[PDB]
Ligand binder design. Structure first.
Ligand SMILES: Cc1cc2nc3c(=O)[nH]c(=O)nc-3n(C[C@H](O)[C@H](O)[C@H](O)COP(=O)(O)O)c2cc1C
Ligand SMILES: Cc1cc2nc3c(=O)[nH]c(=O)nc-3n(C[C@H](O)[C@H](O)[C@H](O)COP(=O)(O)O)c2cc1C
Ligand SMILES: Cc1cc2nc3c(=O)[nH]c(=O)nc-3n(C[C@H](O)[C@H](O)[C@H](O)COP(=O)(O)O)c2cc1C
Ligand SMILES: Cc1cc2nc3c(=O)[nH]c(=O)nc-3n(C[C@H](O)[C@H](O)[C@H](O)COP(=O)(O)O)c2cc1C
Lengths: 356, 356, 354, 356
């Protein structure tokens, strides 16, 4: 069992990092190009990022749903800046229009400055308290229940969603986060726990922690990983692309990016930035795991680099740990979606082996 | 100058009111039908209702935008249940994908039970205080300002919308409401003031009140009206159709709907229900102005009934009062969009006279 | 088993016959409206007419194929004005793009003036000879065979269609015609035999004739009927709609239509135009011939309440008719009217769609 | 003045020539991908090839017209296998549906076996006699005339097309062919004469000949060229890409392809295969003009290879001869459409300089 996702670059796209050379602006036409490419190639879905640097996820996902047949959309909900009852009605409507193709990514918000710009002034513990109260209302409302809820942060009275979703009991909940509060929330309410591309040993420890917490609640959760990928026909070509991707990066931009990550209140971001510490040398932190992406890009900071045999082998290693969802990306997002499907799909389990 | 809108029945559609006989469920295909009908017939735009009884406005409008060329979407924002910065980003993204076809309807929420289900426990004056603070943030954020705002209800710090909208300074704000708080808010911040289909004398008084208040703020506002329409080739056919529309309505339905409106906290809803009082006699409150819709339906509760000459004549009276936007609807919404465009457009000003 | 089709008005649409009042021109947007209506309402497919007065069937059908999900397209081929190998490749591409939603209507051409305008100067017997030779090449080419064929009219040598169709052995062949040559052709090569809306006794005789010939060829053919439909909630409303449909028709237009039909070398058109002789328009219970007063081709309509309309359909079904191709004025609104009033009274899956 | 076209691979696509390795099947989805890329990237149009090895041109263009906004479609008509009146009606319908985006490529048919497979048994002179009679009927029918014509090959009597086209007097006629009959037909009836990518000196001679013949008819024709393009950021990358494109070609495929080109009765095809003769050495017949494509591919068999500066300079040479249309292609067609648009458009005249 394996779900392979792609990524919609709603914050921008291009050939290189840290420079405007060869940059592609986010347009409806280009988003349509990437989404329809992923649809026809047979990817399970696409992850749509959310944040101040992105166009709105819900507008994009809804606009592309009628233009695609099978592709699923992993769209982010952001508790604390929208009413849970309103959020559930949006989730139901999009799930209904898409005929059950909506997936939910629970995003807590790691940048306090970004959160204060949205009107939320909560501490790290308070953000997860809101998310816990949010998910309880959202899950119960989508199951047809008239919800009365009075917690520390959220209060609703007779909350209903009159239009039930297609997927039961509700669209699957995906969630990522590395703090103790995050792991407790994942073990109790979510369906899939997502992690960024740490080395296999570190990933295994995070998964074991979630399993133990989930077992105490009598639940099991599935696991997914988010990874950039630079795959070519030969390993030499792949590594040249990795060097070419970050050649135009200045040392000033590396210093500014690391200082901005230090201001983030996110344990996942602190772990991702601690793999390189803004150092251009020794970026291969593990076999075929290259951390050059994290020099500038925020969030996902590691990439699998190599020929198809090497990339599939690293995928198999993550798969052997219990991971069933893989969310890949590449620069630029259109071309690399074709490249990954044509070079790696035949080496993956069904149905990806037969798609190519 | 005149803009003629149609209506997207996101809360359901059918041939009759108050019954499930001959009802059309809200599907993507059917909404596509109505929106594409309105686009090709030459309607200026469509109004999309919002509320607990509707599918989500933002998901619907975004899904239909790539499937239409010229048609504009009058979409509702609801201050108090969503962050103003997030709402601004959504408007910008939809305005960008549509290439400047987005119009905003500011909705305060007249049903206290619906609002408490959304997590809002505000009084009537507090709801208008929130909307005042919400609109101030939203308007400035869409103009490129990094906004700091600390009011009674909303507080943002470094609120930014990085993607500017297509329409300047922002997508136009349409607003409806009959209370004194509503008239102050409309005179200060909105672009078009909307009213439901009251008789011309009452409409003139509401328009005169708004003009006077807007002058104190050094502004002028445009005016629009919302009406159902039952137009046939002869007056007898129109009046026969109007009778058939409410033949299945029972007294229990009338009592249940009217008592439900008593719980509503809306001045505009209270004015609309005071026209008919839940009684089936004397439903023609003015020449060719029939209030039979408001027996069950909430919100717009009056319709123009007559032959094309009479309907066009009633439209001119409203235009002579200063009304420039007309938002029409009919049952069922697909067929009646064709009927109005084929029977009434040739009798209206340009460009509607030349479309046929 | 029953297939209910609708109709794409590619030659024009409106509310009334014989007048330009309330007419809807053929645009991409309006064609999109009718096709998407038919798709979402659950119609099996749409028949797309062909002729000098229509937009080209292949262009329209291709343009609507990516905008529809389940709807089938009954598209016409015209032997004698296009190479059979070229026609076969077009059928294959459209069938592949549509994922097997293409249906083929074989049209021989009943208007000699229109045929001479396209460059074909064949007699009535010559038209069916060309069609017979056309279909033999077309059917074999789509089955992957490199075809060598040298007939009286058509000659191909190493004719191949490299892209195989989705439907096997080829997209189904629908054909209509009342002559003895047409019946021989239908019994030998076609899959569905279509007739216009004659009264049941006349329809039954034509079906019996095709059945006997098909048994001699060791085949069975399915049967379909083409019918206009005017259905309202009560019979009085339906008949009022029928009267309103033809109120703008004078006798100058009637004489122009009948004189035009006197030049058609078509057996199915003369049988259709002999039911009214240019009053007493109800030639059978709930079968009204007012449509054929101007419109060439389909000339009868079922008029009545849903119970009456379904009953007339049930009578046709009991004779062996499995395909029904309906239409109404205007074609968008009436597609909804038929689906909401008659589908619940029809067999599966139409009973469950509404 | 310059119009830059791309190409729809309706006969198949892939990463390499002469092998099925890394091949992309022609699907509706993939054609939608290529066409929409060219539309959003700003190409004037796409050329759609015709022939036994392709999916039908008219079905494809009709399928993509509603899915694109500005892109033009250069579609081929083959006289001798379809009635001119029927063909004119198809052009009118597609021109009307596309709102005047249809361009016509007149194709005579160079393969006698393909022509005999379609039922045409004509010699080279007879094919041009048929085409001459075909175009006269087609052009006049589209101008509203009821045409009576009795020629050597074609006879129509009261031929009419009731639906007039959008472009007047008819959609522009593009034509390619190098024989004396082709040059007479182009100078007499067509709007744009197209040639394949021969060296600049040979192209200049052909253009001067077509100019002289057209002047005797008191006409001027525009000129276009069809070329493959392999452009990368550096010249070394381009030539390695050119070498890799034909590395998997075996000599049993070159011999089987050259023997089939001999059977062709096509002057232009004969000149194209005379540039290389099937040899793998000295394929650069002119500065940055590489003939490696014509080793297998029938028809267009020369490519521009180099860095953006070199490719732009070769384009300028052809333009200096009077060429205003450039029809480009690349492997694979989706990726290379972006590559050409991002590397060469800024070096071209307006509007291509401002698109990037
Ligand atoms: C796969 C994945 C996807 C994420 N997507 C987003 C996103 O779109 N926007 C965002 O702000 N944070 C995103 N995050 C980060 C977390 O959702 C959250 O914002 C925060 O960083 C978690 O804090 P914590 O790790 O200290 O518990 C994502 C994390 C993961 C693992
Ligand atoms: C044209 C128009 C459209 C409206 N649309 C909505 C709507 O979609 N949802 C809603 O809850 N209220 C709608 N309203 C009503 C107001 O937005 C609001 O809910 C309330 O009635 C205003 O309160 P007030 O009348 O006491 O000033 C609309 C009003 C008008 C005139
Ligand atoms: C259901 C049906 C559909 C037809 N559709 C067309 C059409 O679209 N265009 C057309 O020219 N003829 C059409 N025809 C007519 C026949 O295909 C053909 O032109 C002629 O009338 C048959 O010749 P015959 O009756 O003399 O044997 C149709 C006939 C039937 C019964
Ligand atoms: C730019 C261009 C495009 C062409 N496209 C086609 C095509 O789509 N199909 C085809 O069969 N021939 C095509 N040809 C070739 C001619 O249309 C014709 O078939 C033949 O090869 C020319 O004959 P001639 O050179 O002896 O005069 C094309 C030629 C050119 C220059």
């Amino acid at each position: 069992s394996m779900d392979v996702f792609w990524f919609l670059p709603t914050h921008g796209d291009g050939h290189y990092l840290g420079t405007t050379q060869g940059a592609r602006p986010v347009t409806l036409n280009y988003l349509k190009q990437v989404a329809q490419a992923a649809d026809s190639l047979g990817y399970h879905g696409v992850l749509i990022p959310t944040g101040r640097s992105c166009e709105d996820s819900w507008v994009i996902a809804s606009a592309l749903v009628p233009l695609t047949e099978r592709l699923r959309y992993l769209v982010a909900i952001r508790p604390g800046i929208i009413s849970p009852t309103v959020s559930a009605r949006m989730a139901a409507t999009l799930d209904r229009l898409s005929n059950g193709r909506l997936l939910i990514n629970v995003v807590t918000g790691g940048d306090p400055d970004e959160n204060r710009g949205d009107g939320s002034f909560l501490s790290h513990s308070e953000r997860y308290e809101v998310t816990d109260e949010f998910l309880k209302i959202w899950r119960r409302v989508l199951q047809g229940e008239a919800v009365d809820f009075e917690g520390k942060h959220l209060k609703v009275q007779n909350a209903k969603a009159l239009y039930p979703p297609v997927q039961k009991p509700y669209p699957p909940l995906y969630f990522g986060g590395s703090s103790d509060a995050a792991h407790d929330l994942a073990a109790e309410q979510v369906d899939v726990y997502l992690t960024w591309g740490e080395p296999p040993a570190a990933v295994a420890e995070k998964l074991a922690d979630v399993r133990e917490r989930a077992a105490r609640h009598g639940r099991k959760v599935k696991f997914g990983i988010r990874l950039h990928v630079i795959v070519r026909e030969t390993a030499e070509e792949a590594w040249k692309a990795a060097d070419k991707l970050i050649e135009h990066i200045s040392d000033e931009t590396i210093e500014a990016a690391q200082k901005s990550f230090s201001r983030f209140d996110s344990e996942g971001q602190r772990r991702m930035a601690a793999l390189h510490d803004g150092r251009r040398d020794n970026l291969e932190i593990a076999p075929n795991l290259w951390a050059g992406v994290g020099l500038v890009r925020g969030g996902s900071g590691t990439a699998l680099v190599g020929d198809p045999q090497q990339v599939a082998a690293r995928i198999k290693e993550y798969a052997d740990l219990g991971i069933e969802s893989f969310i890949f990306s590449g620069y630029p997002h259109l071309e690399e979606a074709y490249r990954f499907a044509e070079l790696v799909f035949p080496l993956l389990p069904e149905p990806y082996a037969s798609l190519a």
